[PDB]
A paper describes a structure:
The penicillin-binding proteins (PBPs) synthesize and remodel the cell wall peptidoglycan, a major component of the bacterial cell wall that gives the cell its shape and rigidity. In E. coli, PBP3 (FtsI) is an essential protein of the divisome, catalyzing peptide cross-bridges between the glycan chains of the peptidoglycan. The overall fold of periplasmic PBP3 is bimodular. The C-terminal module is responsible for the transpeptidase activity but no clear function has been assigned yet to the N-terminal module of the construct.
The crystal structure of a soluble form of PBP3, including residues 57 to 577, was solved at 2.5 Å resolution. PBP3 crystallizes in space group P6122 with one molecule in the asymmetric unit. The structure was built from residues 71 to 567 but absence of detectable electronic density did not allow structure determination for residues 93–112, 119–141, 152–162, 202–228 and 537–543. The active site responsible for the transpeptidase activity of PBP3 is located in a long groove that can accommodate the carboxy-terminal residues of the PBP3 natural substrate, the peptidoglycan stem pentapeptide L-Ala-γ-D-Glu-meso-diaminopimelic acid (mDAP)-D-Ala-D-Ala. The transpeptidase activity of PBP3 relies on eight residues, Ser307, Lys310, Ser359, Asn361, Lys494, Thr495, Gly496 and Thr497, found with few exceptions in all penicillin-binding enzymes. In PBP3, the oxyanion hole, defined by the amine groups of residues 307 and 497, is unexpectedly occupied by the hydroxyl group of Tyr514 that is at 2.7 Å from Ser307N and 3.25 Å from Thr497N. The side chain of Tyr514 is free to easily rotate and liberate the oxyanion hole and should not play a particular role in transpeptidation. Electron density around residues 499–510, a loop that connects strands β3 and β4 close to the active site, is weak but sufficient to allow its determination. The N-terminal module provides three loops (180–190; 202–228; 280–294) and one subdomain (88–165) for potentially interacting with other proteins of the divisome. Because domain swapping in the PBP357–577 crystal would involve a large twisting of the (88–165) domain and, also, because domain swapping should stabilize the domain and hence provide a clear electronic density in that region, the domain swapping observed in the case of PBP388–165 is probably absent in the PBP357–577 crystal.
Author numbering:
A (entry chain A), B (entry chain A): 71 to 92, 113 to 118, 142 to 151, 163 to 201, 229 to 536, 544 to 567
The structure:
């Protein structure tokens, strides 16, 4: 069985020689020193719970049963496998996410970090996790790689795409001040967190205005946003090769009512995985270049495919900087010395029967450093009892420092 | 300036020290031994014309002006670049293609070879070519990388997709014997090269029946084939990063007449690049796994995305073996000791004014070895005055021998 390593060779799964037995005191997967006092193999996982969801585990016979171990079983069973993951980044991500999940007493949390220039997954973590070196008393719900198996309505994180589309289609000018007074579609209330009489395009992102974006959406054909979200990869498979990998939920509708058109512009009526959202934000970070994702190491250059005009995406990335500046909702994500471009917010959870219950997903997505993004990051916190904004700041701050990126502000 | 090498480090572009001069006998990009008898740089291209279209060239100042030299100019100007190309494969491909173009007195020819498991471009060649070590008296028409810049109607090469779709949608059973008598749609004649009263699904591919496939097409909604050809990458960008890279021509039609529906099933009303066709055939070879292409070296595994059910594609690949067996139109492509799965044929050329003239494109596309494809190959011969079938055999035979693939038949 081949070794799974991180992108620089750091060991993440290593086969370890153990003996089997086919006396009463010793015996009551046997250690070498105890078999002699009286052939098979087992796996050792040096990062343990830090990368458990991604790497998975094998069974008694050394067959892969979950995660990378199962997904690349034939490759491993006989080559090594260098993942795209950077273990320093993985460990810091896990640390911040795990402790944030604990502090807010949430059900779970997930974090994905993507290299903007390559499509590489540099970190992929969830909490609660489990120790793959000892699978015992670990509940099934703590084992899912939620970054790829769980889905949620992306809410405000789609809003930058609404502004890009609307500028692109001449529905609005960079000049424009929008009427953002709350209003009704039938009896459906469209309103923001607070009341704002009017806003700038920047303001529409800065205050995350649902009113603002719904008016942009209704000024264009229903097909516009369907086209833009798809270009950014929403509703499309992420293709890592991982078992349990999901492709979200995506409308397949020719005819849209007015309210549906409005709620699409603020991220309802579709669902994403944390990983698809990371890929949205990597396509924002490259200023409109779509690149396929990879959990295995990849050498640059990766040309990818331009799906949206650079100048439009640069403009909107600038607008997004306001979210993490005073007055913006993501102010708690700010990093001393760095420009960041983020969206933060909230989506109501779906219950057992598929009906909304009173519990929330909190999410922060973004790229840094804003003057030329290198990393796309997504932080999702499930049912904590801008909860995700500080976590994003702490994680992204660590990433920038570890990777020696020149301060920006 | 970085070195461009092949996938194993073989040099394909190397910077060479030359001096400049800012006497009457010597001088009349100066050699080192002559500058001393009395600082800048220039490029040397060891494979010369073999890889000229792909690699391109630089100008006096060492700026990239065509091909890889221009496409990856910023990367090179300072890193080396390992292409996906294997120079042994490139050289044999060029040799067979160049001599075939000469022998049939054709305007040009093009050949693309793709690794079925990785998306890698292993060979990309055209003829006539030119020597990039001396750009002088070389006409502009000999400089285009036609594999990516030229487009043609794919004709019979789409037919295997028609059969896959129709089996998949239950329009036909593997059992079925089809009425393949020539017929009219309005006054439009639908007929094959020769008359066949009836054919098996295999027979429909073996004899490349336009009648057969048009009946399959008309038995299904016009959207079916539009969907299948797109899954295989037709009408979609190839994303190598190469300047002049084209994405073919692709219908954008809600309403199809009967004749249009028929001619789509035998490969008219769209146009492809040799490279897009290579990617179609690589997706056939993987039994329905779509993988993005790469001119740079890529490490396995590459999961890609399943776009069509394996069992259907395996079935049709088997049917395709008949084309290169006695009775099939591609019999001259047969390789002693190997099973191959191919389509061969002809498309009428478009003239200056966009009207059909009496000149032809001949093409052979396929995968080998049929029992588990490793290579997808496309050979296109432009305006020779199954012309491409022997060339395919000779090229693919060389590839299989060079790569040490176990005989198959
Ligand atoms: Cl849940
Ligand atoms: Cl021509």
């Amino acid at each position: 069985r081949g070794m799974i390593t991180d992108r620089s060779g750091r060991p993440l799964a290593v086969s370890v020689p153990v003996k089997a037995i086919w006396l009463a005191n010793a015996l009551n997967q046997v250690n070498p020193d105890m078999a002699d006092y009286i052939e098979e193999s087992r796996r050792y996982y040096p990062s343990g719970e830090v990368t458990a969801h991604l790497i998975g585990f094998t069974n008694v016979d050394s067959q892969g049963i979950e995660g990378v171990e199962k997904s690349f079983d034939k490759w491993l069973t006989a080559h090594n496998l260098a993942l795209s993951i950077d273990e320093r980044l993985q460990a810091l991500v896990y640390r911040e996410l795990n402790n944030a999940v604990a502090f807010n007493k949430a059900e779970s949390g997930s974090a994905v970090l993507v290299d903007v220039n390559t499509g590489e997954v540099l970190a992929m973590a969830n909490s609660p996790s489990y120790n793959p070196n000892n699978l015992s008393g670990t509940p099934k719900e703590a084992m899912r790689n939620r970054t790829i198996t769980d889905v949620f309505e992306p809410g405000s994180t789609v809003k930058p795409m609404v502004v890009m589309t609307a500028l692109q289609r001449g529905v609005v000018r960079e000049n424009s001040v929008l009427n953002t007074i709350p209003y009704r579609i039938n009896g459906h209330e469209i309103k923001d967190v607070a009341r704002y009489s009017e806003l700038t395009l920047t303001g529409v992102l800065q205050k995350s205005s649902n009113v603002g974006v719904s008016k942009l959406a209704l000024a264009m054909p229903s097909s516009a946003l369907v086209d833009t979200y798809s270009r950014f990869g929403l509703g499309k498979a992420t293709n890592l090769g991982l078992v349990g990998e999901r492709s979200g939920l995506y409308p397949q509708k020719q005819r849209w009512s007015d309210i549906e058109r409005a709620t699409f512009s603020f991220g309802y009526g579709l669902m994403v995985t944390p990983l698809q959202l990371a890929r949205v934000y990597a396509t924002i970070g490259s200023y409109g270049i779509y690149r396929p994702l990879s959990i295995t190491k990849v050498d640059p250059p990766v040309p990818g495919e331009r799906v949206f005009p650079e100048s439009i995406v640069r403009t909107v990335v600038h607008m997004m900087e306001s979210v993490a500046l005073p007055g913006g909702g993501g102010v708690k994500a700010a990093i001393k010395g760095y420009r960041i471009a983020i969206k933060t917010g909230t989506a109501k959870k779906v219950g057992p029967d598929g009906r909304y219950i009173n519990k929330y997903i909190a999410y922060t997505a973004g790229v840094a450093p804003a003057s030329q993004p290198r990393f796309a990051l997504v932080v999702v916190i499930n049912d904590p009892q801008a909860v995700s904004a500080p976590v994003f700041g702490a994680i992204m701050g660590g990433v920038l420092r570890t990777m020696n990126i020149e301060p920006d502000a």
